Amino acid sequence: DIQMTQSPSSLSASVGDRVTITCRASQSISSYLNWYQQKPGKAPKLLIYAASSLQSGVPSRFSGSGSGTDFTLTISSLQPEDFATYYCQQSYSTPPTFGQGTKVEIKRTVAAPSVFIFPPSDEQLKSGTASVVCLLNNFYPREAKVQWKVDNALQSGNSQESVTEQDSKDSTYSLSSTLTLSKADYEKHKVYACEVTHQGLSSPVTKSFNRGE
């Protein structure tokens, strides 16, 4: 189906840089390749069609090049409106195919997360469930590491994380790891803690609390 390969998967670049994403075709596809921009949660926007032709409305900094197999979408001097996800589409074969998509991210200095821990509420304990939340707020880069320790015991297969996109101003992420437990397990052990490992931290920070205290 002429599967498209985009490179790189993710990209960290600042405002004013020249960025370059590469869409590689499995077979020769002449010059039938398009480019798209998708704001998170919004409908995709057509940037360049026919490998190089610029769609009406798109600024002059957007330019495409290449033919056959190796294509390239080059934009010069990044602008705040241009931080989104970009896909390449082939129109050569009868089944069209899109790439995996490159996500350009705002470059930023390393910021440490503000770690907060939250015991489960009493209204939730009446239902028969306990959810412990470990918060990582306004940090950079995106990768973090959250490990739970219930009385110095490593947990697995029972916690889930969620990450927010880059903020429009300070360009920092936010992550929350929720540990879902039954009330029977929560009433067993005293000390709960999440261990956060990040680049912005000099050593893995651990926030702890005790049941009832």
Place this chain on the structure above:
Amino acid sequence: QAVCPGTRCEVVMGNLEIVLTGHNADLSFLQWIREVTGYVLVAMNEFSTLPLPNLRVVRGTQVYDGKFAIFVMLNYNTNSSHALRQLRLTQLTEILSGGVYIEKNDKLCHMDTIDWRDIVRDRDAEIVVKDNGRSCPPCHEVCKGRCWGPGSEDCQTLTKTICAPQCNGHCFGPNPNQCCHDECAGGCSGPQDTDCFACRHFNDSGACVPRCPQPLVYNKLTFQLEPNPHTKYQYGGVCVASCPHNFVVDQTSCVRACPPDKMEVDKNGLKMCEPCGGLCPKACEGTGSGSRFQTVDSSNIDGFVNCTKILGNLDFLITGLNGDPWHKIPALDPEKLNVFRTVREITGYLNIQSWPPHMHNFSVFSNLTTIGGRSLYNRGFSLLIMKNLNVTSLGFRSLKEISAGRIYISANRQLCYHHSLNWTKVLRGPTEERLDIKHNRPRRDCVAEGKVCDPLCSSGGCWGPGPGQCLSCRNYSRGGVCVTHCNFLNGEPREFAHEAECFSCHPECQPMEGTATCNGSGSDTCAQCAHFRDGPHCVSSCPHGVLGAKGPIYKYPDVQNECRPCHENCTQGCKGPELQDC
């Protein structure tokens, strides 16, 4: 190569004109010159000596000032240290036509001593030598007052001979025993053909001959024309075994470019161009991206005439055919489309999006055979035929190879004959998703109207109806057209077969009734000769003057019509083996 044109070198094809060249120029590249066809012209020069130690003949096929084959004049300067002093022609011998004009050369010596009546063969040619050198020293004592310089080796002259009226104008002596050879332009040193100074016609390895060795020599062992391993070709008045490295052979002579009725071909080292089998190739411009024209219109169609190989592509859009009334263009005349019947190969692609309604078949592309696909019209297609609504069949009856690309044939709601085509046989390589055939005329309709591939075609398919439209036949074929039989035992031309293709027998085979006539194309494959038998070969007339290795061969016909060599002492040929028949 010892020959060099006129207007390192031994022969000069043209005039040798030396003017204005400086004093310090190395004139030694003229050391090997032997013969000059045109005239010799030396003027306005400043060097001291002319050196021609090997020059022997100036034929003077062209005279300057209407009278002279040698013209030397005013080779000096007025207020500098450069002027001509000597003409060193220690081996010069003869001039065939014209006179000699030497005048106003301030310090040219020894010209008054050499008798001019010897070199020039025209008696009443004007020979004048005045106001030349001044204080010239006398000629050397060894030379008897007949020299070209003060040296003791620069004095030939002599050669003067009277003649008997029998030899007319070409002789080496006065006695009746002293006629030069027939092939000698002027004088000779002996009766032989290798002793003459210049040849009337050609010089081959030292001898004067009428013509150079012929490419074909009759061989009395094979009773047939056979190639000659000691051949020579015509380059001017010199027989050479190989033309100059840039040249090409025409028939038996060398030429820089073959005439337009022949095309330069290489035959195992030797480059000669044969006559074209009808007409000669020619490359012309394409059409589309990379060409000058968006389409083929009435303003570019005349330039495609007589073209054989289209370096590019062909676009047939509606605007080119129907004209463009917005930008004044004449609509193309449809009967002029027949200029494409000469096309054989298309380098890139073929795009057809509109065709005249009265033409239901593309028969104007009959002799088209190859579509390379090095460039593609649109999406990866080397062949595009769309929205052609009033077209019945294709008609590419000699199309055999689409080297690369893909094929688009759709929306031709009246096209048939394309259904059973083995596209693997034409397009080379994968057929995985390289065929776009849809929305045409359905199979259900073509079979009902009787528009399927003719049952005379193989399992590959056909481009249309009839015999001459098959890819491959089920039995035989002739002239790109399938048949049921060759004309073996009867027919207008008696024919034979070679890998399922009929070829006409040799015309000298006798037409046999009820049995096979010939095995192959040569005359050694007839079962019986129609006229005469020259050994195993059938001939129209017996050998009567053919050139052999030992001499001309003369033969006579038998009562059973078999040529046999006549006795060694006939001249005018023979009507029989006896001496009375010469």
Place this chain on the structure above:
Amino acid sequence: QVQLVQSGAEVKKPGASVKVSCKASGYTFTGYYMHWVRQAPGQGLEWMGWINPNSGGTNYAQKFQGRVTMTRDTSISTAYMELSRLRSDDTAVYYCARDHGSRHFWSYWGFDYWGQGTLVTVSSASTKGPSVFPLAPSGTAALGCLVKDYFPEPVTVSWNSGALTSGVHTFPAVLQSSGLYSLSSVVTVPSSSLGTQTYICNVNHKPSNTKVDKRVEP
């Protein structure tokens, strides 16, 4: 102007059928082909098929060919796509896009105008309202709410009916193994105001008609 409007969000059970519409306006509807592209949550794009809005010709992808029927209604300029034989892997946001060429053979199949996107959630779970549980703090304080166990997406969380917007971070909903979504919404506030100002989070779940408020005290 050219604008494509799609139908509302749909929630189906594994095995049913969904027929999403795409109302076109602002151009010659029969002049340009209509493409259908879906995108799984947090995944790439996937082309399904195009429709010739003038002749009615279709061209479905081999993966979907057999259980997708896309049609047209030229009297109202509307295109329909009916994906039957639903699975849990068919949960995606289905966009409708317009081909940028009137003559399709010379088109480069570039989509210049898109719809707003129709979310189609296909899961075996049943429509359940959300449970709101507070997350109390423990210089700078941090608090939030926990919207746990609901179906289907989406929920709208706003603090103080929209009065407080500084520092609000509403995390994307994570899909649990039970088939329900869990969602957290934390806000950072000065520790001085912790106790002098009321902080209330407001959750609205349209599919279950659930509107719940919740105060958050230490």
